[PDB]
Design a protein around this ligand. Structure first.
Ligand SMILES: N[C@@H](CCCC[NH3+])C(=O)O
Ligand SMILES: CC(C)C[C@H](N)C(=O)O
Ligand SMILES: [Ca+2]
Ligand SMILES: [Ca+2]
Ligand SMILES: [Ca+2]
Ligand SMILES: [Ca+2]
Ligand code: NA
Ligand SMILES: [Zn+2]
Ligand SMILES: [Zn+2]
Length: 316
């Protein structure tokens, strides 16, 4: 909408106070004009019709319980925008400053979040498995990274290409979490998962087997569940990415860690310059190797570490 840019204040899902960019025209809307062609946050009002209504507030104060998922969806979309712009020189998810749209309060008791081809969508959770899912910066950045992938590599959401798609979202979700530097880790969704249980999450990149996911190609899931295992077999790639960044010895194969910044550079270049819609794990290895070669040279430690990491998870 047309109005003047304002700065509201509110609390997120976890009770943390933060400022949010809003727009004033009779009401204060969750419309951030400071980034690209805008970040827009919507209320789905417990329905499944999307996007719902652009979030309107009478006084530019967002401290109600009902406000908190919208505060975080809006704020963390901004952090993610900043990450891609400042770290990768990418302007929004399409590289041309597309407006970023998110809806919160989707459905009732909805224990998930997703990118629907056009926008982000966040459930509130059922209060037991999840609290409102926009409270997790890695969740927000995971979903927005699906938009990046869909506008670049276009990895089909099935089988090995779908597991790469999922792993890319976990990788950059985690790198945004580290970028924001609030309780960063290599787990996915811990801030909004199971409020009665400390230390758990949906997935672990450092140890996928913690939650039953494979950490080696020999353990890949080959059934039909989960679109051929896209959230399961992502663990094989998540582990390789963790090893590239942090190093370690995995099934007797030692990897020299090269750090998160270089991990991000290698995988961003693979995603945007080498992967295609049908890329499989072996083709991802080749893409990461050639990406690291482009950036650092064929004899570099960076290339050697990419090779060791994919060796360690059984991907030739
Ligand atoms: N996002 C993953 C994990 C489940 C989220 C909670 N039910 C999936 O859709 O399978
Ligand atoms: C990151 C998760 C909370 C959501 C995602 N759609 C799965 O995995
Ligand atoms: Ca208010
Ligand atoms: Ca964390
Ligand atoms: Ca995390
Ligand atoms: Ca928990
Ligand atoms: Na699991
Ligand atoms: Zn995903
Ligand atoms: Zn998914």
């Amino acid at each position: 909408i047309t109005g003047t840019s304002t700065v509201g204040v509110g609390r997120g899902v976890l009770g943390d106070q933060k400022n949010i960019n809003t727009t004033y025209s009779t009401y204060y809307y969750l419309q951030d004009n400071t980034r690209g062609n805008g970040i827009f946050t919507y209320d789905a009002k417990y329905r499944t019709t999307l996007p719902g209504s652009l979030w309107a507030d009478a006084d530019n104060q967002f401290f109600a319980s009902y406000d908190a998922p919208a505060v975080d969806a809006h704020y963390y979309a901004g952090v993610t925008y900043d990450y891609y712009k400042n770290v990768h020189n990418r302007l929004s998810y399409d590289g041309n400053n597309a407006a970023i749209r998110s809806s919160v309060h989707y459905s009732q008791g909805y224990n998930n979040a997703f990118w629907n081809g056009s926008q982000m969508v966040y459930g509130d959770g059922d209060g037991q498995t999840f609290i409102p899912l926009s409270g997790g910066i890695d969740v927000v950045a995971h979903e927005l990274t699906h938009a990046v992938t869909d506008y670049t590599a276009g990895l089909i959401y099935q089988n090995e290409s779908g597991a790469i798609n999922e792993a890319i979202s976990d990788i950059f979700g985690t790198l945004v979490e580290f970028y924001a530097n609030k309780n960063p880790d290599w787990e996915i969704g811990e801030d909004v998962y199971t409020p009665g249980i400390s230390g758990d999450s949906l997935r672990s990149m450092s140890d996928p087997a913690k939650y039953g996911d494979p950490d080696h190609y020999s353990k890949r899931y080959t059934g039909t569940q989960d679109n051929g295992g896209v959230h399961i077999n992502s663990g094989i790639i998540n582990k390789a990415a963790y090893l590239i960044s942090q190093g370690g010895t995995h099934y007797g194969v030692s990897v020299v860690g090269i750090g998160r910044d270089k991990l991000g550079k290698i995988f961003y270049r693979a995603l945007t310059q080498y992967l295609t819609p049908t890329s499989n794990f072996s083709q991802l290895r080749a893409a990461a190797v050639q990406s690291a070669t482009d950036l650092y040279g064929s004899t570099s430690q960076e290339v050697a570490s990419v090779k060791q990491a994919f060796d360690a998870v059984g991907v030739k």
